Paper text:
Angiogenin (ANG), a 14-kDa basic protein is an angiogenic ribonuclease and member of the bovine pancreatic ribonuclease (RNase A) family (also known as RNase 5). The enzymatic activity of ANG is several orders of magnitude lower than that of RNase A towards conventional RNase substrates, but essential for its angiogenic effect.
H114 is part of the catalytic site (P1) in the native structure and makes direct interaction with D116. The main chain of R114 also makes an interaction with Q12 (which is known to be part of the substrate-binding site in the native protein).
Author numbering: 1 to 123
Write the structure that this text describes.
Amino acid sequence: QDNSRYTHFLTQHYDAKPQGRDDRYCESIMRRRGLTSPCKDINTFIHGNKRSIKAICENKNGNPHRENLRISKSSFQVTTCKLHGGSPWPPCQYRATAGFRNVVVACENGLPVRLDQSIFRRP
Ligand SMILES: O[B-](O)(O)O
């Protein structure tokens, strides 16, 4: 149930076990999560379990980062979906970059609520 900022973060940025990690996967998941109206230019999904992501908000799996962000201690499997072409309007074609990296989040009440998306602009 999507009734919190935490849960909405999961809807936007969490996919436990990605079926594949290619361009087709991106097109499909971006649509399924409601990020193709208008087409979001870049979005990153974090894989694996949820508790590893939550733990970024505490010393268990996070460190302070910049003014009030958190950076993970562990690395995460992630897939970044990059809008192909300029257009803000469907069909939204996407290119996937599968990666393994540290995640930065903004936390509220011990829960991640926002991803620093710009860190995934570069492969
Ligand atoms: O024990 B640590 O947080 O990996 O340094």
